[PDB]
Design a protein around this ligand. Sequence first.
Ligand SMILES: Nc1ncnc2c1ncn2[C@@H]1O[C@H](CSCC[C@H](N)C(=O)O)[C@@H](O)[C@H]1O
Ligand SMILES: COc1ccc(C(N)=O)c[n+]1C
Length: 258
Amino acid sequence: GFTSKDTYLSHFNPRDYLEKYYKFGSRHSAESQILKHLLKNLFKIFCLDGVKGDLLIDIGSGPTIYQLLSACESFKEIVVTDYSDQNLQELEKWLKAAPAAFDWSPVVTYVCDLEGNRVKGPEKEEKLRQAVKQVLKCDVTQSQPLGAVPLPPADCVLSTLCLDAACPDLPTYCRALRNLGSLLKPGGFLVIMDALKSSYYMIGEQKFSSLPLGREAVEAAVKEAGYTIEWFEVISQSYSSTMANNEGLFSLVARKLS
Ligand SMILES: Nc1ncnc2c1ncn2[C@@H]1O[C@H](CSCC[C@H](N)C(=O)O)[C@@H](O)[C@H]1O
Ligand SMILES: COc1ccc(C(N)=O)c[n+]1C
């Protein structure tokens, strides 16, 4: 069996998720080490590499913004999407600078440092808030992930830690890659970062399924789905034993063949 989609609407607590994985505490936890590596990869893709354009769609954003910090320097507009309405509400609390919003300042500061300290935290945060115009529902398992909502074909589709959680099997994972491709313009970029060989992840006592994929199956599915791989990186760093049973993480950049 595998976690049903509806479980994300009801049982995925966005504040608990942020507390458990993104607090970015002084302790050199496995979670903070992964967060740092993700940030470095995202900086390399968006600011160092030529990954830019008018529109980036972030798929399965959850309640997080860390994956958009470097992207807001390179894209006029960023659209954040998720299957969960609760997650999108928590994201909107940060976007609207509400009092109950999650404290992203340690991560924001870290991203500013990476980029050369050209700007400081508040200026960086304001650039992200200005870039995010739409907060949409999405279902990666559907041929139209965004439903009846129309969007121009995007220059880039980004998905961090979403596809392993949303796809119950390898054929569904390959179809989800094809479905994301429907949102991309020909030659547009696909950026995926996710756990390798992970069959579950936890949010406190709440268990969530994950599709356990190795690097070869991820690369094969991306090629089967109609992309060409630009680069593929595997990091050996895994989450704490209490959080997930992954054997590292991967990051890839691919281009949609027309
Ligand atoms: N079918 C589906 N379509 C879209 N999003 C889905 C989905 N099934 C699960 N999700 C979402 O996938 C996310 C996994 S958590 C990942 C959040 C964030 N991108 C990060 O990097 O931390 C959750 O927000 C969940 O709601
Ligand atoms: C931190 O969020 C994580 C961590 C690990 C996994 C997994 N697929 O093992 C999934 N998520 C969403």
